[PDB]
């Protein structure tokens, strides 16, 4: 009998693969959408950290 | 959020990390002209990309014994791009401007600039020094070009007006401990809806150091100052042959 608590809450016996991602379809390349000019702060896609 | 900023207009783009907020000159944005205000009947042209993008003028140097500079807009762009090659063809012109200034330095340097925008900044000579001798300023001091022109008497801005009161205009500072750039947006400032781009010069940018640059030996002495700017909401009218001046 599993009467202790550290055995009930245990993560042992996990046959599942936690996947962050998930596949999607792509029969064609992506359709470029329209854009216009923006002059805002905070928003800044160019600056990355590699 | 207030420090990082990005500026995307046209094919071009600007980034900056240590900045400040953005200024809108005299509290409103650019615009195209209304059908009520306007008077001319001809249909303008409005390219919207080839002209409304960031142009980069010239890169100055900031020594310890520097005094100041000015540039006249929109004279700076009359020989640069599809902008300039429209402004020579046509006779009538309307636009706004975004204005971005660069000066970087480390955390051991110190100084402060003043980046102001003054409409109708007439230049005045010294009257021979004695006061009696009437003179006038030459053509290369009123439309000096994209290479800018340096001040001689900055306490009076070379027009009998102090620099102490230049903050009432749209101003910003570049204190090298805090920030490294100044972004200013300006609408079209004139009594007339359209006006020429070659004769008239609607306003002048000024860059005057108040607290002088200083550092210690072993540190990089070259501290450039670069000037970037973009037209916005640009219109043109009155087509004909190209006129240099």
Contact B181, B23 (CB under 8 A): no
Chain A residues within 8 Å of chain B (Cβ atoms): 37-47
CA B165-B5-B103 angle, 5° bins: 55
B13 contacts in chain A (CB < 8 Å): 46
Half-sphere exposure of B50 (CA within 13 A, CB side): 12
Say if the Cβ atoms of B6 and A37 lie within 8 Å: no
Q: Which of A34, A38, A41, A43 to mutate to test the interface with B (most CBs of B within 10 A)?
A: A41
3-state secondary structure of B198: coil
Rg for chain A, CA atoms, rounded:
23
CATH number at residue B103: 2.60.120.20
Half-sphere exposure of B59 (CA within 13 A, CB side): 6
Pairing between β-strand B23-24 and β-strand B181-186 as defined by DSSP bridges: parallel
Which value in Å is the resolution of this experimental model?
3.3
User: What is the residue range of B134's domain?
Assistant: 1-245
SS (H, E, C) A14-43: CCCCCCCCCCCCCCCCCCCCCCCCECCECC
**Considering only alpha carbons, which residue of chain B is nearest residue A47?**
B15
Contact B197, B128 (CB under 8 A): no
Nearest-angstrom CA–CA distance, B199 and B94 = 14
Nearest-angstrom CA–CA distance, B83 and B77 = 7
**Considering only alpha carbons, which residue of chain A is nearest residue B9?**
A37
B52 contacts in chain A (CB < 8 Å): 37
Q: How far is A18 from chain B (nearest CA, A)?
A: 34
Q: Which of B2, B3, B5, B53 to mutate to test the interface with A (most CBs of A within 10 A)?
A: B5
Count of C-beta atoms within a 10 Å radius of residue A30:
6
Domains in chain B, number: 1
**Considering only alpha carbons, which residue of chain A is nearest residue B185?**
A39
Closest CA to B9 of B46, B49, B47, B45: B49
Cα dihedral B27/B203/B111/B179 (nearest 10): 40
Sheet holding B92-102, edge to edge: B23-24, B181-186, B92-102, B224-237, B55-61
Say if the Cβ atoms of B5 and A40 lie within 8 Å: yes
Nearest-angstrom CA–CA distance, B131 and B115 = 31
Say if the Cβ atoms of B7 and A39 lie within 8 Å: yes
The strand pairing partners of B184, in sequence order, are: B23, B99
Say if the Cβ atoms of A40 and B15 lie within 8 Å: no
CA B171-B148-B156 angle, 5° bins: 55
Measure CB to CB from residue A41 to each of B4, B10, B98 and give the nearest one: B4
3-state secondary structure of B155: helix
Count of C-beta atoms within a 10 Å radius of residue A22:
5
Nearest-angstrom CA–CA distance, B116 and B118 = 6
């Amino acid at each position: 009998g599993d009467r202790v608590a550290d055995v009930i809450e245990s993560s042992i016996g996990d046959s599942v693969s936690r996947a962050l991602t998930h596949a999607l379809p792509a029969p064609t390349g992506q359709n470029t959408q329209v854009s216009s000019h923006r002059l805002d702060t905070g928003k800044v896609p160019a600056l990355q950290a590699a | 959020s207030d420090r990082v900023a990005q500026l995307t207009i046209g094919n071009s783009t600007i980034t900056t990390q240590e900045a400040a907020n953005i200024i809108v000159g005299y509290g409103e944005w650019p615009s195209y002209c209304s059908d009520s205000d306007a008077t001319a009947v001809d249909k303008p042209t409005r390219p919207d990309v080839s002209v409304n993008r960031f142009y980069t003028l010239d890169t100055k140097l900031w020594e310890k014994s520097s005094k100041g500079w000015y540039w006249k807009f929109p004279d700076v762009l009359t020989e640069t791009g599809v902008f300039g090659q429209n402004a020579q063809f046509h006779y009538l012109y309307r636009s706004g401007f975004c204005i971005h200034v660069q000066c970087n330095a480390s955390k051991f340097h110190q100084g402060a600039l003043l980046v102001a925008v003054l409409p109708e900044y007439v230049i005045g000579t010294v009257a021979g020094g004695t006061g009696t001798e009437d003179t006038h300023p030459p053509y290369k001091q009123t439309q000096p070009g994209a290479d800018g022109f340096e001040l001689q008497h900055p306490y009076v801005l070379d027009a009998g007006i102090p620099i102490s009161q230049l903050t009432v205009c749209p101003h910003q500072w570049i204190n090298l401990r805090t920030n490294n750039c100044a972004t200013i947006i300006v609408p079209y400032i004139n009594a007339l809806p359209f006006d020429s781009a070659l004769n008239h010069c609607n306003f002048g940018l000024l860059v005057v150091p108040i607290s002088p640059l200083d550092y210690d030996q072993g540190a990089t002495p070259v501290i450039p100052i670069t000037i970037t700017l973009a037209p916005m909401c640009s219109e043109f009218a009155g087509l004909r042959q190209a006129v240099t001046q």
